[PDB]
Amino acid sequence: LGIHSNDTRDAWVNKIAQLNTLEKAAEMLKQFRMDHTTPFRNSYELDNDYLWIEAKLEEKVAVLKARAFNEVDFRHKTAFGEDAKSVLDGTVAKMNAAKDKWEAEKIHIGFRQAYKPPIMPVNYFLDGERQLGTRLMELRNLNYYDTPLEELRKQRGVRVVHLQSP
Amino acid sequence: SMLGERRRGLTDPEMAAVILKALPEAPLDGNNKMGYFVTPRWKRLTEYEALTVYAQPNADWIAGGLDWGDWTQKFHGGRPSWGNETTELRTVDWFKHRDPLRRWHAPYVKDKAEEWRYTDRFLQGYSADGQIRAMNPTWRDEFINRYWGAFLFNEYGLFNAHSQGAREALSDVTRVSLAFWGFDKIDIAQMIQLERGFLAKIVPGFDESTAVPKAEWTNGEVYKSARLAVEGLWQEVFDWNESAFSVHAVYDALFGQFVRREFFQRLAPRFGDNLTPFFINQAQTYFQIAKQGVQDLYYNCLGDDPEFSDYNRTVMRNWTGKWLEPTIAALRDFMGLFAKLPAGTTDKEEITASLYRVVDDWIEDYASRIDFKADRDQIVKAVLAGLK
Amino acid sequence: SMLGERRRGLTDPEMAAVILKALPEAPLDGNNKMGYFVTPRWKRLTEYEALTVYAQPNADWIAGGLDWGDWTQKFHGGRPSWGNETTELRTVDWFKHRDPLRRWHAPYVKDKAEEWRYTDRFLQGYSADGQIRAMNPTWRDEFINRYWGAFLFNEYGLFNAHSQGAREALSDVTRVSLAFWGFDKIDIAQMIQLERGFLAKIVPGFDESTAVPKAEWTNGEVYKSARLAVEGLWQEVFDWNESAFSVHAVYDALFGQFVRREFFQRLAPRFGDNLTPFFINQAQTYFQIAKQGVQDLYYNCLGDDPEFSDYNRTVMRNWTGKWLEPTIAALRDFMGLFAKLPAGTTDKEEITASLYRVVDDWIEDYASRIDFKADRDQIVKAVLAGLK
Amino acid sequence: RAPTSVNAQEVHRWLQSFNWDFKNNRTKYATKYKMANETKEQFKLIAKEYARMEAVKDERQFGSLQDALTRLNAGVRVHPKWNETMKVVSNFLEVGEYNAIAATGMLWDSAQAAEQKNGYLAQVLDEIRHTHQCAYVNYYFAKNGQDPAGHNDARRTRTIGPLWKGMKRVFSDGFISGDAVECSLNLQLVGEACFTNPLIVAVTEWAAANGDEITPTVFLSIETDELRHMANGYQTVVSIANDPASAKYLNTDLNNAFWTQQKYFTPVLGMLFEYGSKFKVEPWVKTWDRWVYEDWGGIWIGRLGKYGVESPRSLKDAKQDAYWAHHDLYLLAYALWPTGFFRLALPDQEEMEWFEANYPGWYDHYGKIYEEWRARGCEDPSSGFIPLMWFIENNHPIYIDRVSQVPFCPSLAKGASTLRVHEYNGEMHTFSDQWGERMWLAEPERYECQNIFEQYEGRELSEVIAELHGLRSDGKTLIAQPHVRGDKLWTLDDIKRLNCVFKNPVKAFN
Amino acid sequence: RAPTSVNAQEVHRWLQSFNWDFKNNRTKYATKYKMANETKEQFKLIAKEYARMEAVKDERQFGSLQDALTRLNAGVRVHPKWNETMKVVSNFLEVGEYNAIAATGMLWDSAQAAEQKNGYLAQVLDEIRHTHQCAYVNYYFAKNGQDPAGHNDARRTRTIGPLWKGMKRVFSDGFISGDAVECSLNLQLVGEACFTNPLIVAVTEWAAANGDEITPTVFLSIETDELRHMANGYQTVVSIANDPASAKYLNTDLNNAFWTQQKYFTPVLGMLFEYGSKFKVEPWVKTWDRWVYEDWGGIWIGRLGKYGVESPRSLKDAKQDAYWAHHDLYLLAYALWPTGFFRLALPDQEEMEWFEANYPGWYDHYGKIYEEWRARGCEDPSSGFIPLMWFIENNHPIYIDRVSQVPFCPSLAKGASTLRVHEYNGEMHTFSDQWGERMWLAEPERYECQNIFEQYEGRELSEVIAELHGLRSDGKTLIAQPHVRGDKLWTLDDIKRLNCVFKNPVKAFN
Ligand SMILES: Oc1ccc(Br)cc1
Ligand SMILES: Oc1ccc(Br)cc1
């Protein structure tokens, strides 16, 4: 009852087994990613298992979307019904329009939390990934060291709890 | 000096004496088998499996992984080093795949090295035996230097098509096979060129340049459709599995097999050309080699996955259809080549018999595995609609 | 035990220190090149030369030998272990010969092994690709099985012709080359059977038994004179040089080349047979490798010998005339095979042109080297009489 | 009819013209750089020639291993400490070679010029060969060595310990996650040019010293393939030297690449060398200074100066934190010995004299601690003492850098002692230096690697070991050990009886 | 349409049918035997598969030599005495291998059944392989060893000494001169089966014990080929058993072959082993008894009894003349040290004890002789003394057996003290035993080998050494030495001081 097999993991497997609706599952996934993934998760209560849980959910959503979509849709339509190419091209716009790294950062992370497959099709996802990431980096690596650590900590909004340097 | 200045623990009396004194009376564990915890695909565990399975550090959140936790460093944005997000296919274990030929780096470069060495000896024998004399000048200067040559860019394209997979494959066993599949493909492209380079040395005016064969590829009409299919498989697909599957269990199986076997491998002889066949022999040996791996991954492993069998077949059936059309098209445009062949070279009775072979083999080895019910007559009919 | 019972001087502390203590401070001679005294053929002495030249313990009374005195034990009657009396040819030094490919044992079996493993890889790809499907049934069952099959006995007979030279060759370099020329011949005979054996596996009803090919060889007409020539070269010739020279610089150079290259390799393709050409590529590579050696020994060393040039050419000319007649007879009867082919396969002009190619190559690569006066139209005319 | 053939170079001449232009002909990975489509590769190789030259090497290597070395019992007559050391060196390097496969694949996908792609491709295959070679070393020592445990299952047993996390950072994730060019600098511009290349030769040196002739037979063979990987890294810089983004981003990704790599290898490699052997080859400080400063930071980086490349700004900081890093790290490695997949030994008298002689002040710090632990019975299973207890008793917390995963103890270290602790959206983060802290601040989402204390929190030590298979064949004796002798090996039970439960050290600040 | 191929056995099944009938299809060599027309072979091989299995062995062998062994400097770390032993052992064996090439060529011609021809054919190629392997050992020791002289030119410097003559009898002319079957007995039924196969293994043991890992690497590879050669010699017996003539001649040819081989290898091998080594493995006497008596005379020969084969009638004498034979010979070998291509050493104190212990009475005879020669300064260049001189002063003539070429001193030897001197048609002949004498009496024309005394008569020692290139690359220092130390090496001039002139010992008889 620990690292690979534990009560909390078993609990979620039975929670995904009761999912029998692309809609309901596609929703629980989106909500799961908002609650437990990326530095902006709603809480770190599942930090040791969310990665494994999230995938066990992607599987349920993947199977359904396949038995619920059609040739053309499974390839161009998200599990939410959205039109893949639409979102991709849209998100890239906001990014290329982003004012600074702080703005870019949020859009990219956000893009992943909502459209990570089985939601968006793999082909469009990774294509954005190459475009979004490219912009995020360009803004971030520009004058990477100019901002002193004291200030950077403020920009990030972190709560400093302890510091020691002889 | 004769003895050197560096003392070695295995032979230096002083140092070895100390080492021998530190040794335990017997091995501290009787289990001398590396990879003993791996599930053997065959009778006993093979060297191939021991040296390959689990080399990839995937955690349990990637079907099959034995590690735990997230990656240490990720992409700006949060994209994982490797993740379930890079391919539609799902499985109970990505390390289930097994190359039927059990090829790890050593056996692989050993086999290819033998071929390289023999190839050399052969070319030196061909040139010395004057076997070039019985070779038709037209075929030599037009069908081998233009149409065969241009086909190299087709293979080259399929080669590059493996780049993303080499980076994204979700397991060692799958990554090694992919790498080999793509590496053999560029080998062929370089062999197609090697011949033109050889002909250049034995035929006075023959130009080895790729200018002519490239133009035929870039702007020609014979391959035009084929090239479009390549560009799509290579630069439009971001799913490593879709790319590998569509390329090996669809495109190359239909278009590739025809162009290589049912065209040059079946006609080059008729023009007193045993040279080109020497190389197609390799490409076909390779093809058949890659096929066993492609079969074991997408069918034995994914297609018959104890958990996502139906799901995968659905996706592969989907992919099959998605690319079956551009493949059919690629063929159609190719048919326009027979018209450039001297009269009597071949007729429609043959072309039909050959096509049905490629298609029947395709259906026998790939299609029926994922239940992609196909119409042999319609397909042949569709492609055949490209004749003069 | 983990360490074993035997103690080794290289790793055992006590024994090694005893070893190390007795060692000189540096080598007792700075000349660390074995065979340094051998006269190099090329820029620098080769591993091939160092390991081979003078391995044969010849005394100075056999041209080029470095030892002295009679042999320790001779044959009843007095015949020497090795002696000048075993061949008509004379030279200033039997050790001058050099295999241009510099083949000593390791390189020889290494290359043959590569060819073997690739062959196996080729066949498995050939059967898996189903290429046998387009092969003409008549060519397959009649010409490959019976006629190509009967030729194995020809190659086998030539292999056997080398048995006495293996025993009588007057130098290591000549003995090693002869052995390899002979070994390559039995290999070809075996590859001919391997193909028949392969066909028996992927072709229902094909009988791999040698009964038919053998009966064709022993009692047919097509190879009658060929068999009579082989039987003679092998068993009526007791001179190891007459044997090798006549086999390679006369019989195999004309008949052999015609059958392998101008008949089977030239026509097999026209019947959808890429299988036989695969093995013939091997035979021709072997032939061209042997030729280099045969030319060095008989033309570069013996035919151009500073003291015995005229004499040796007279003898080789004598031999060429002696074996040219039976060789023409073998070609003449072989012409009969053309009548057995399906109408429209080839015509009299093609046959004639192909004979001129074989006769012209022979003139340039062999006959002209010893000033043998060959009339090409006369050779061809005599052979053509065999056409039914 | 003269014998004729065609060689690699003659076919490679036209390789560049193999790729053709068209709309979507571009890399599929995010990058800030633009690699030139006219870039050339140094070695004119084709698939077949590549295979031949590699095959010729395999023949030698495997021939030595299967024949003379086996007959000499080379797998056994190796010092115990080194047999253990190779469990880590070979398997850790194996994963580096393995992710290099994916890295060069990603790189192959990046290049637009046919020759540049071909070069990376040659490495793709090389890394595959190196993965299998390193695998063969463990395979061989398992089959013929004095102790197979670890050599035989490192691919899973390495997941228990903390040192493995840092390895994945510099030789797995650092190699493939992020801008392709950044991954290249980590792999070829720094990792290989500054560490791996010199490292592999060094390893063979220490191996021979300790009776290990197997590793030299394999590693020296891997070394012959390095000249080609050096060229790729050099060509990666060349292919972007004309691009405007280079002068604006290169030096940043490079410094970050430098710090990332040295952060781990500076302490880890030195530790493996000096603490994993009996016979020494050379003091690690002398080696490090040579490798990092002269060869790399000087000669290697110097040649790239004409392309805009400059010395990592974090260089002086590295040399400062370096001196005692490996010594500081072994203390933690030994204290946490039950979490490894290998056996550790404490310095013997000769070694303590060697350490003090080359590191004045070593005995009064490290020396005394080890003699204290040994007298208390850290080697004896019946003492009930694991050095981690000593750290707890004397309030010396061990933290894991959220970025590099390197374990550090600020209150005890003789080297760096800085500690920065932050909280952000409900999670605490511990950092060991100013560079790693910045990387996390600017890229929070790139570094969320859970540490051993977080995952093992609340779990009793023996439960973790057993769960992750940290046992030898008899299902009872531990793979890991606090000594390298044949008797008195610790068992799962000896660990359970202590009732050690992991705690997340960062919670003390709450 | 399933992947299929064909293997060796599948093709071999029809190989027996390859041969066909015709009036002149018969052996070109004289013989009293008729090899059965339908005889079969043990291994179903074809050229391709033969090449493959040999190539695989070569990879390991050369792999070990070029890599690990070279890196271990194994060519040097061998006892001096043994480096010298291998000059004779390897080059002499090389000729046996070489003549075995011609020998099996002759057998393949004798054989009428395609399968029996193919068995011999496979040996013809193995013999070429073995010739090149033996050459390689001398080649490797010359390139990397402590003393290349001799190793680098044995093919011509071997001709100076008397020991070479006997070698060409048992391993050259004995392999190819006479009835093909007789030659088969000398080579296979006796040579390999009784001496070389057990010999090859023995050499690897002695070699390993003296630091030589080169010879085991090569000779152990050679040994794996001897399975097929044993089957050849065995089928030779089977292919003639059903022939009326076999009952009349087989046992007589076998007896002569046995004596031939034994007469030379008994004293020579034991000499090379016990006096050519520092570290001993086993006393030659017990080694011999096992090989000749147990393993061969009983086990091997007994199996062939069914075919009419009987135990050698001269076996009793061979054993009687064995015990001291090798000791008798080393006295002559050292006495004539200036005629070799290797350096010899007097037994040291530790060795003399070993000899006395294992051969009681060894000291009172040989021990004292060596001690005297030492006192006379046989080791020192300025002494002006050479052991031969001692034989002249004490009227101890050295004769050469007209048949076996084995040198012997009947008045001093502890073994056979027999001597038979005959005059025939103006020539004198000296024999050392009743078997060799019968051979000559019945077959005068088969044994006309002129001996060194006959060829060197009236010649000054230094002139002969110089003429035959018995010098080191400096052009003055002799290749052969009376000691194995690194200094005080005799020069050609030290031998010309001496002014020793050869004389034919048989000329004294009236
Ligand atoms: O021998 C050793 C094995 C592992 C470490 Br970590 C250190 C030393
Ligand atoms: O080492 C030795 C070399 C030759 C003889 Br003979 C004896 C011993």
Ligand SMILES: [Fe+3]
């Ligand atoms: Fe590498």
Ligand SMILES: [Fe+3]
């Ligand atoms: Fe590398």
Ligand SMILES: [Fe+3]
């Ligand atoms: Fe032999």
Ligand SMILES: [Fe+3]
């Ligand atoms: Fe033998």
